[PDB]
Every structure is written in C-alpha cells, then in structure tokens.
Design an enzyme around this catalytic site. Structure first.
Site, short mmCIF file in Angstrom:
data_model
loop_
_atom_site.label_atom_id
_atom_site.label_comp_id
_atom_site.label_asym_id
_atom_site.label_seq_id
_atom_site.Cartn_x
_atom_site.Cartn_y
_atom_site.Cartn_z
N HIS A 56 0.78 -1.22 0.00
CA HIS A 56 0.00 0.00 0.00
C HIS A 56 0.84 1.31 0.00
CE1 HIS A 56 0.97 0.99 4.08
NE2 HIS A 56 0.91 -0.31 4.29
N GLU A 85 -3.15 -6.97 7.22
CA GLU A 85 -1.89 -6.93 7.87
C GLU A 85 -1.86 -7.85 9.09
OE1 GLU A 85 1.09 -6.92 7.75
OE2 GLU A 85 1.87 -4.87 8.04
#
Lengths: 197, 197
Positions: B9, B79
């Site tokens: 990201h 995550e």
C-alpha cells in the site's frame, strides 16, 4: 548512508540464445546498448563512484551509466568462470553430474568442473563488496557486473544457502540495491527493470 | 505463465512517523494517494485479476491499480496483528523481551504477544498465495497488501528462515514479483519503486 547498487550488464547475442557466457567476452547487441542507455537515464548520475567488470558487455554498460565519472575496473567483478558449461544452454547439461549437484546443493552447487561453487563464490564476492563498502563508506556505489556474479553476491551478503540462487532471476540491466543497518546488509531492491520500454 | 505481483500500500501518516500499524486502519496521505496513482500508471492494467487486503490503505491503493477490473477482497490478506507494538516505533520497543526474540530468531521471531511469529506467518501466507496461484493458473495476479504480510510471504514462498525478514526492506507501493518454474516460486523482482517520481 552507504548504498550499494549492483547492475547486471545489458543484453548480448548469447543472452538471447540462452548460451552461458562465463569468461567469454561477447559484445552487447544494439538492444543491449539501448538497455544501457535506459538504465543510465534512470540512475541519472545519482551515485558517487562507479565500478565495473572489465568484460566489454559490462564495461560498455558502465560507461553509459557513468556520465562524467571514471569507471573503475575491478578484476574481481568479472563473471564467474563456468568451465565446460560456457557456450552451452542449461538444457544441454542435463546429463552432467555437476549440473545435478549445481541444482541439488551437493558440494555447495559446483560451477562445472571449475572447483568453485555457488557457496565459495558467495563468500568471495560478498567479501569484495564489503571491502568496497568500507573503502567507500557513506557513498552510493554502482557496480556493473554479471548475472551469476551478482546472484552469488546477493546470497553472500544476506548469508543465504546456495540453492537459493535458483530462486532469483536477474534480467539485463536489472538493478539490485543494498543499504547497511548496524553494519549489516539489507536488500532494498532486486532486479528492478522498469526503466526498460 | 503464472505471475504473482505483490504490492505494498501507499504511504500513511503513521508510515511517515515510523509508527507500527498492525490492525489499525489509518488512511493514505495525499502523497500516498499520489504513489498509488503512480504505481497504477506503471502496472497499466497489465494483469488478469487483482486482490486486496480490506484495510483502507490497501483497498484504495488497489482501486487505483484496478481501473475497471473488480477488486477482490481477501480477509487473509490483512496486515499481521502486531499486538502491543501497534502505535509504537521500533526504537520504543528496546525493553521488550519479545522484540529481542523478534530480532534474534528465538521462537521463530514473535510478533509481540500475539502468539504468532515470522515463522508461522511465513508458512500461512505462502500457503494462501500458493492456493490463489493454483486457482489462477496461467494468469497474472496482483495482490495489494502490507509490509509485514508481504515480507513473511516472500520468506514462506522461498523457504527462508525467519530472521531473513530483517534483511529485506519494502517501501510504499514497492512491487515484488514471482514466477513458477513447475510450481516452485522464483523471485523476479523485489521492492521496485522506480515509478515513484
């Protein structure tokens, strides 16, 4: 602040054919010259010192990158000797017992009958690069060299096992970078080729 | 050819601060948005299917990359939970015995007090990726995810030991790629960030 940039040389005719070069000194193709100009524009003079293998495919790539800086020749950055493999394709080696061991990890992955292996080269080349990084502490250093030589360097710098070599694929003018944390190498890019068209 | 493309990201405010994010869901900075557009422009729609972590920093990055293609959410791509480490810098953790272990390799490198490790996440993430790749055989696959998740993935795919995690550094919108030579993953690039202005 020490940054090491390892750059594989541009395309030669033997790279197109998948023929192992080793100690041969084959010239860049026109396309490989262009790859060299491409990587040169990318790096755009963003480095403090540049070293190269003297073999022409590397040196000419380096001279494209160098701009107004001198290319420092380093004999120990020449390609790994491949012995009787030179001139062959990897497909042509399936019978060779050494080639089985190069794949499997036995004897640290021999390079033909050169008496040297991925393992011994890893350590040797990593040590050369470490000494370079000490000499050029806090600089950005470009080294132009070869596929096998760069991959063994990666392994030796990160202390990986020799059969990890077969799990890295490095392209012509691929860019690979390291920084140092607490004196320890850290890989910050591997085979970046976005500069090509 | 089956090709796996793993992308971190864009920038978050906590990434600028070095604050560990874990299961927090901090938004992209304006510069993070711009990174996402630059990586989207580099990839130029050249993949068959895109998957993303559902955390916003990833999803928004993925939507810029995707264009018209549908983003597929994968929960297993979120995550890695960092436990009590979330919200701290790594400098703030020097007292923690689990942080000492995370660096040394003891217990496979624990993520704080989560009961999971670099070792356990490597295996789990590699399995998830290998399944998505068997499922999308002969396709080019983009997965948009996070630094820790992607690093453990690389380790699991390449069968590397847990402390190797500390020898890889991955940037915002860093591109990492794999191909498969008969089901065995081969790293063809790591943390390519040249698309960043």
């Amino acid at each position: 602040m020490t940054k090491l940039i390892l750059i594989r040389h541009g395309e030669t005719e033997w790279n197109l054919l998948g023929k192992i070069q080793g100690c041969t000194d084959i010239e860049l193709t026109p396309n490989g010259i262009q790859q060299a100009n491409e990587v040169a524009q990318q790096i755009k003079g963003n480095f403090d010192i540049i070293y190269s293998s003297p073999l022409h495919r590397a040196l000419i790539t380096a001279q494209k990158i160098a701009g107004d800086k001198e290319v420092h020749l380093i004999e120990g950055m020449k390609e790994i000797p491949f012995g009787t493999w030179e001139g062959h394709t990897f497909e042509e080696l399936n019978g060779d017992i050494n080639y089985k061991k190069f794949l499997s990890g036995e004897d640290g992955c021999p390079f033909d009958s050169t008496g040297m292996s991925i393992a011994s080269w890893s350590k040797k080349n990593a040590q050369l690069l470490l000494d370079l990084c000490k000499q050029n502490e806090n600089k950005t250093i470009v080294c132009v060299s070869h596929g096998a030589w760069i991959k063994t360097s990666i392994l030796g710098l990160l202390e990986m096992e020799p059969t990890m070599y077969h799990k890295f694929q490095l392209g012509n003018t691929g860019i690979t970078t390291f920084i140092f944390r607490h004196g320890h190498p850290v890989l910050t890019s591997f085979n970046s080729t976005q500069h090509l068209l």
